[PDB]
Write a protein that binds this ligand. Structure first.
Ligand code: NAG
Ligand code: NAG
Ligand code: NAG
Ligand code: NAG
Ligand code: NAG
Ligand code: NAG
Ligand code: NAG
Ligand code: NAG
Ligand code: NAG
Ligand code: NAG
Lengths: 171, 246, 214, 49
């Protein structure tokens, strides 16, 4: 192998560059924000139940029901060393926690730097006026939107729990 | 007028442009100076070019160092193998050297082709940002720089390009108390584009990216609905410009 | 604690490696374990900074032998710090190293960012009043150095025996030259698709009345 | 033979890594344009407005 050149050097440089690019991938995905934001548990959300998406302090692994279902529904020694990842699942879970805190509180306004508090009904009204829907439809039909929203959340919970067809993409 | 068009593109009224024009000029010139300083002294911001250059250099130098590799033969240099072995006896050793150097060339070609594919992917991304961040205005958040986007400026670079994103960032905020609607006489009132704020005395309508109170009137609001369904409707007198003009 | 059959003297693994055995003298179910193997890694700042060197062992704890054991392996020559800062050089498992406090090599868990509790109410809104025009720099590479290698000259440097033995082996030099030529053409296609966008050539007038925009 | 097999493994790992990087750029752009912002682009953020 000494007589067969610098193959080991080239292959280890290539694999180390692979691992560095994996780190760059996960960082450029999940370092969208630099300021960790925290969800206030004060639930004046106009009737918008966020229980299965908020971080739950009932469990110490601070995430939601749906991510825990994603964990629990998704499943040598001759130098084949699996390197550890840089960011753990808890750290990217806290990054998703901060992003959900920002989207609940500040909508898009924290994307321009600092966060700016806006009540969530006005965020929904602005997102309706973005697609040309006049914002009166939101204020006149709020509880039906709450029903349809929370029912869709329950439907996607059941569709992830009783069906694992949308997971093999990761597999 | 181009910057006025871009401010109306990001939903900011162009009066702020003409009121704080020299502030915009001074902040822009200071930003250009900060970039000059951060490119002149801080040379550690151009890793993107030199990493590709050093990768190409490592590939070339490894391909060079492959020539002296013996590859199981008697020696590495072909000339001594020609000067020391018969043409029916040098066949095996020259076959060894051809096999090893051919394998290294295929390694180099595969590496160059994959690296060029990633470079072409980055090239199409860069050309799309040239087509959108410079050539026009994009509502896409964090595609043409951080924050609200106005324009961008390109500069040359060896095997590269540098975008200079003119971005809009709101700086100074203040805690304000708001309401979704105004009840007047049973007629509810919704803002045409904005938000109903009160400093503590009277409900005012303002713009979402700079605080400037408009006096709430039918020429500013949208009359619809009733005073029953809106969770958060408040009582205030919506102004009418007809009554002082009758 | 495995259990063979009374004739079975050994066994393989899933990966066809001899994992567990039974002794030829004594009826007992053993197992073969691989020894302690790992990668030697070096944590350091630049030579243009200092010469203090921290040593990282991969995936195994401090067996051979400051002893700071993480989930990525043994780590000596560093300093464990409770004050979690930003990651400077990545190591693994969210634990990084830096060069701080006079000063030396420290080791700490990556602080994920400045923690903020943004306020919220039913009716409290935050509205901007003043603004900032920041100009941010992006760097994007475009092309690559066009490169051709005469592979016949590379493999067979000024020979003829080698030339005949290469001509025995098909058109591999032709294939590699054609592939590199296509690469070199698509490089210039990249450069034209980036820059050659406006067929006109515009230039500024000398009167640079730009409202105070230097 | 083992070195040829190892190099084939390395080559396919690079190809899968490049595919994953393209998907990663898609994921980051969708975080910046479907989560952080309300995009007008039809079927860039799933089915519907
Ligand atoms: C939201 O739904 C969950 C069921 O997943 C329930 O336990 C919780 O009480 C609900 N919260 C509200 C505010 O409706
Ligand atoms: C708004 O109120 C919150 C309450 O915690 C405070 O933290 C924040 O600094 C206030 N901002 C302004 C601009 O007064
Ligand atoms: C609120 O704005 C109105 C506008 O004229 C002003 O009269 C009033 O004094 C302001 N109140 C406070 C507390 O600033
Ligand atoms: C203020 O918050 C309370 C919850 O404590 C809510 O019942 C009330 O409707 C809110 N006020 C308005 C105007 O919506
Ligand atoms: C608004 O005024 C009406 C009378 O027109 C009154 O019945 C109602 O209670 C007022 N709103 C509040 C929140 O007090
Ligand atoms: C390299 O080290 C010298 C002292 O050894 C120092 O003066 C110099 O500033 C360093 N180089 C850079 C680029 O900082
Ligand atoms: C390494 O860790 C294993 C278990 O994780 C333990 O049994 C062993 O004693 C440790 N060795 C050293 C040298 O710390
Ligand atoms: C870190 O803090 C713990 C207590 O929280 C303490 O026991 C430990 O000594 C600290 N680390 C160092 C290196 O002093
Ligand atoms: C914005 O901040 C700058 C900082 O010097 C100041 O000069 C300017 O007057 C401010 N403008 C407003 C409207 O507060
Ligand atoms: C623009 O800035 C440069 C560099 O500071 C300076 O030399 C030049 O005089 C300035 N021109 C104007 C008109 O601002």
């Amino acid at each position: 192998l000494l007589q067969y050149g610098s193959f080991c050097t080239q292959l280890n440089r290539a694999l180390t560059g692979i691992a560095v690019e994996q780190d760059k991938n996960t960082q450029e995905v999940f370092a969208q924000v630099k300021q960790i934001y925290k969800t206030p548990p004060i639930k004046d959300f106009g009737g918008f139940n966020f229980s299965q998406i908020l971080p739950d302090p009932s469990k110490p692994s601070k995430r939601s029901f749906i991510e825990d279902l994603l964990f629990n529904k998704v499943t040598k020694f001759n130098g084949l060393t699996v390197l550890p990842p840089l960011l753990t699942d808890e750290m990217i879970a806290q990054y998703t926690s901060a992003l959900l805190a920002g989207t609940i509180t500040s909508g898009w306004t924290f994307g321009a730097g600092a966060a700016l508090q806006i009540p969530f009904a006005m965020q929904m009204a602005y997102r309706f006026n973005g697609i040309g829907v006049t914002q009166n439809v939101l204020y006149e039909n709020q509880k039906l939107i709450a029903n349809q929203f929370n029912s869709a959340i329950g439907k996607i919970q059941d569709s992830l729990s009783s069906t694992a067809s949308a997971l093999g993409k990761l597999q | 007028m181009q910057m006025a068009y871009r401010f109306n593109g990001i939903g900011v009224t162009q009066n702020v442009l003409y009121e704080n024009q020299k502030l915009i000029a001074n902040q822009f010139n200071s930003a250009i100076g900060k970039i000059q300083d951060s490119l002149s002294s801080t040379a550690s911001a151009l890793g993107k070019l030199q990493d590709v250059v050093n990768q190409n250099a490592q590939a070339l130098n490894t391909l060079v160092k492959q020539l002296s590799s013996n590859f199981g033969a008697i020696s590495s240099v072909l000339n001594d193998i020609l000067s020391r072995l018969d043409p029916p006896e040098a066949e095996v050793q020259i076959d060894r050297l051809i096999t090893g150097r051919l394998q290294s060339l295929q390694t180099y070609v595969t590496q160059q082709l994959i690296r060029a594919a990633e470079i072409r992917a980055s090239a199409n991304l860069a050309a799309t940002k040239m087509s959108e961040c410079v050539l026009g205005q994009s509502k896409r958040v964090d595609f043409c720089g951080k924050g609200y986007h106005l324009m961008s400026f390109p500069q040359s670079a060896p095997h590269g390009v540098v975008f200079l994103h003119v971005t809009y960032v709101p700086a100074q905020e203040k805690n304000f108390t708001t309401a979704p609607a105004i009840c007047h006489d049973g007629k509810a009132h919704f803002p045409r584009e904005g938000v109903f704020v009160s400093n503590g005395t009277h409900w005012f309508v303002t713009q979402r990216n700079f605080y400037e109170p408009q006096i709430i009137t039918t020429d500013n609001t949208f009359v619809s609905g009733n005073c029953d369904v809106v969770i958060g409707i408040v009582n205030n007198t919506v102004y009418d410009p007809l009554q002082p003009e009758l | 604690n495995k259990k063979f059959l009374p004739f079975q003297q050994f066994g393989r693994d899933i990966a066809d490696t001899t994992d567990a055995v039974r002794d030829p003298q004594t009826l007992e179910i053993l197992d073969i374990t691989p020894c302690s193997f790992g990668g030697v890694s070096v944590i350091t700042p630049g030579t243009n900074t200092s010469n203090q060197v921290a040593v990282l062992y991969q995936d195994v704890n401090c067996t051979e032998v400051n002893v700071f054991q993480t989930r990525a392996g043994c780590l000596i020559g560093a300093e464990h710090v409770n004050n979690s800062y930003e990651c400077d050089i990545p190591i693994g498992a969210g634990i990084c190293a830096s060069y701080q406090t006079s000063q030396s090599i420290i080791a700490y868990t990556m602080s994920l960012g400045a923690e903020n509790s943004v306020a919220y109410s039913n009716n409290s809104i935050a509205i901007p009043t003043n603004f900032t025009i920041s100009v941010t720099t992006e760097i994007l590479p475009v092309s690559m150095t066009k490169t051709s290698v005469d592979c016949t000259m590379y493999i067979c440097g000024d020979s003829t025996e080698c030339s005949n033995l290469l001509l025995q082996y098909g058109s591999f030099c032709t294939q590699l030259n054609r592939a590199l030529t296509g690469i070199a053409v698509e490089q210039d296609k990249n450069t034209q698709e980036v820059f050659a966008q406006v067929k006109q050539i515009y230039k500024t007038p000398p009167i640079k009345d730009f409202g105070g925009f230097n």
